[PDB]
TrEMBL record, chain A:
GO terms for molecular function: structural constituent of ribosome. Keywords: Ribonucleoprotein, Ribosomal protein. Signal peptide: none annotated. Belongs to the eukaryotic ribosomal protein eL34 family. One of its GO terms (cellular component) is cytosolic large ribosomal subunit. This is 60S ribosomal protein L34, putative. One of its GO terms (biological process) is ribosome biogenesis.
TrEMBL record, chain B:
Keywords: Ribonucleoprotein, Ribosomal protein. PANTHER family: 60S RIBOSOMAL PROTEIN L38 (PTHR10965), LARGE RIBOSOMAL SUBUNIT PROTEIN EL38 (PTHR10965:SF0). InterPro entries: Ribosomal_eL38, Ribosomal_eL38_sf. Gene3D superfamilies: 3.30.720.90. One of its GO terms (molecular function) is structural constituent of ribosome. GO terms for biological process: protein-RNA complex assembly; translation. This is 60S ribosomal protein L38, putative. GO terms for cellular component: cytosolic large ribosomal subunit. Belongs to the eukaryotic ribosomal protein eL38 family.
Automatic annotation (TrEMBL), chain C:
It comes from Entamoeba histolytica (strain ATCC 30459 / HM-1:IMSS / ABRM). Belongs to the eukaryotic ribosomal protein eL39 family. GO terms for cellular component: cytosolic large ribosomal subunit. GO terms for biological process: translation. Gene3D superfamilies: Ribosomal protein L39e. GO terms for molecular function: structural constituent of ribosome. PANTHER family: LARGE RIBOSOMAL SUBUNIT PROTEIN EL39, RIBOSOMAL PROTEIN L39E. The keyword Cell membrane does not apply. Pfam families: Ribosomal_L39. This is Ribosomal protein L39, putative. Keywords: Ribonucleoprotein, Ribosomal protein.
TrEMBL record, chain D:
One of its GO terms (cellular component) is ribosome. The keyword ATP-binding does not apply. Keywords: Ribonucleoprotein, Ribosomal protein. This is Large ribosomal subunit protein eL22. Belongs to the eukaryotic ribosomal protein eL22 family. GO terms for molecular function: RNA binding; structural constituent of ribosome. It comes from Entamoeba histolytica (strain ATCC 30459 / HM-1:IMSS / ABRM). The chain holds residues 28 to 120 of 137 of the full protein. GO terms for biological process: cytoplasmic translation.
Length: 105, 73, 50, 93
RNA sequence: AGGAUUGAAAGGGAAUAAGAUUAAUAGUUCUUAAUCAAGAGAAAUGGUAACAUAUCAUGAACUUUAAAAUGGAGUGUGAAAAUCUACGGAAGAGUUCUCUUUUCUUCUUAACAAAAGUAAAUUCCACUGAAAUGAAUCAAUCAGAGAAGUGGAAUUUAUUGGCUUUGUAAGAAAUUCAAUGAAUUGUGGUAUUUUUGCAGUCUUCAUAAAAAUUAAAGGGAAUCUUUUGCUCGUACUAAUAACCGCAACAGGUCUCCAAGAAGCAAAAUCUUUAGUUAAAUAGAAUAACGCAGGUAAGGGAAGUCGGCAACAUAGCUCUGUAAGUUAGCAAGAAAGAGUAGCUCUGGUGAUCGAAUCAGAACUUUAAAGGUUAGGGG
RNA sequence: CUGUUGCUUAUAGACGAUGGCAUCAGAAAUCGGUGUUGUAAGCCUCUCGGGUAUUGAAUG
């Protein structure tokens, strides 16, 4: 087999020193540098991973399109649909209860 | 490098003044029209000789054209 | 090391420059007693300690 | 499949007949050296071809038995079988 | 507005690759192709929904959320690479009076993007409402705060979007041939290993960083081309000769990549790519006494302070395994039988393939033992 | 006369020494005798085969 060497001067297998050995022209293999695996967005209430948003590095969200870093809904990109649905029902039902309980019962 | 897909978009590339150079590579099966633009190198894979000649005529006369074959320049 | 500070590299270059012998024309001066530089060193004989 | 052997400059060394036979009693059509009834060697004047359709054979098969010749007749040091890149072989010094 | 400096060339971090080139530097030069940052030239739609639209489709103060950014073990599994292998060849080389349609070598392709074809896993959404309880995993685990089924959405899979494919791009490179010019560069595998993710399981009186910096939300204040990219390091060794031990010291000194055979094994042994045949001089002779490695008749610890040293046992399968015991062990207890070569048969799957197990003939120098490899009570 | 030297010398030997021969010398293969192993390679038979054999063995 073909053995390879690090290209940069980092000699230790740290988290930021990940490599991939891929085949090149002529049969020789070159060394790449692979990105770290990143987490996604979580709902602020239930801590569940949000859908519709990619799991990329924080600085790479700026390069994405405007619609690719959020969801077209209230609290989109910070609250899940279950998280939001309870917020709406909490807001309406509590105010309605206050209207009859107090406020000229 | 980006690839244009059908015959319409390539013509608008030569019609536009953003062009910088054109290289035509003839392969054993098809011929590629590589338009060197400012940012990217657009290429069109033409598999019909009749439509290849039409694209050759549409090239503005004031631009450099490189014809490539089994031997590179 | 490969990695070094800029001013440290210039002090390494000076130690290279000073590791030279007396030029021939200097040895032909009248009343000359300086034939060999005794402040000379080699990498494998004395470590310059910097 | 039709592969030939070019002998335009070694007819003095190799007379094309023998060679015409060699193959005949040496291709192992089914492991038997000789049973080439479906192999059409013929004479082809200067060249020698096999133009075989029914039997199974390959170009590297032909180069193998060609090298059997020049080793058998002790003249492999003088010649060397090169493919003409045209489904055929030619002999060089 | 909230708290100052320094502190990591292994922590966090905007963005570059392939080929060629030098006597020596090269993700740094050259060719080609990219990317990033900073600049210049009354406010949209679609889908029931999850959510989706080459910028689009405004969004200030203030506040909030998320990311950067988090242990380990063990199991299963997706993909790539290497190794092995099936089919079909092209080119070159090796052996060849004994055979061998034979043995060997090459058949490659980056960053960044595209979107023909097509995956595995997980989480959500719509319809319906499960008991005769079903669904499923290697294991689990799950379900009227809603299973299974049908149809969808999203994300992860070493860049865009995981894999094949495409642009780059064959014009490069590899292997050949001729004397610069010509030829080729399919398709597969329910195999092994490494790497990289994923999914749930287990474990803690252990719960396994922060900041720079980025995005989104709530709120509703106000009304394609082109330029530049500064400073410093970059040679070489990294060790049976470049480092630390007074030295070209058998000592010590942190990592990355990693072929074949054989085997449970990254063990011992042999080989391929690469490196080397020099590493404090040799020649003749073949005394004693040594240092290192061995063997030995008969006896078998009588030697000795003492079985010191050496011998001995040793892999795998089957049978069998005592007292004692904190009931978990003792245990590989102890003890016994088998094991080779060749020719066959059967069992274990999917819509051709895996090494594994069992059995039967016959032959022999009667088989773990070259290497490796418990002495027991 | 003796010593050196030669026989990569032996009845000897650490080196010296000692012993033998030195042109009718010596060395060498080959052959025969003598041993060891166990029946070669090509096609159970060839086959009591093949191989080794002084190196510190014995003839020519």
């Amino acid at each position: 087999a073909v053995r390879v060497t690090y290209v940069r001067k980092h000699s230790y297998n740290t988290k930021s020193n990940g490599i991939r050995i891929v085949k090149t022209a002529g049969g020789n293999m070159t060394v790449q540098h692979r990105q770290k695996i990143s987490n996604g967005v979580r709902c602020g209430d239930c801590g569940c991973v949000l859908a519709g948003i990619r799991h990329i590095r924080p600085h790479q969200y700026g390069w994405l399109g405007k619609s690719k870093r959020t969801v077209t809904r209230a609290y989109g990109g910070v609250k899940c649909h279950k998280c939001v649905q309870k917020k709406i029902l909490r807001a309406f039902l509590i105010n309605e209860h206050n209207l009859i309980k107090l406020a000229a019962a | 490098p980006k690839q244009v897909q059908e015959f319409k978009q390539i013509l608008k590339l030569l019609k536009s003044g953003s062009i910088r150079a054109v290289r035509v590579k003839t392969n054993g099966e098809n011929t590629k029209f590589k338009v060197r633009c400012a940012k990217y190198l657009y290429t069109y894979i033409c598999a019909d000789k009749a439509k290849a000649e039409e694209l050759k005529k549409a090239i503005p006369k004031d631009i450099h054209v490189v014809e490539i074959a089994k031997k590179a320049p | 090391t490969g990695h070094k500070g800029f001013s440290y590299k210039l002090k390494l270059g000076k130690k290279i420059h000073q590791n030279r012998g007396v030029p021939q024309w200097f040895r032909m001066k009248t009343g000359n007693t300086i034939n060999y530089n005794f402040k000379r060193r080699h990498w494998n004989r004395r470590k310059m300690g910097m | 499949f039709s592969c030939t052997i070019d002998l335009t400059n070694c007819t003095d060394f190799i007379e094309p007949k023998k060679l015409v036979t060699f193959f005949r009693q040496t291709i192992k059509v089914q492991g038997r050296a000789g049973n080439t009834k479906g192999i059409e060697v013929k004479v082809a004047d200067k060249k020698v071809t096999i133009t075989t359709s029914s039997a199974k054979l390959c170009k590297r098969y032909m180069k193998y038995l060609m090298k059997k010749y020049l080793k058998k007749n002790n003249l492999r040091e003088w010649l060397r079988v090169i493919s003409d890149k045209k489904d055929g072989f030619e002999l060089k010094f």
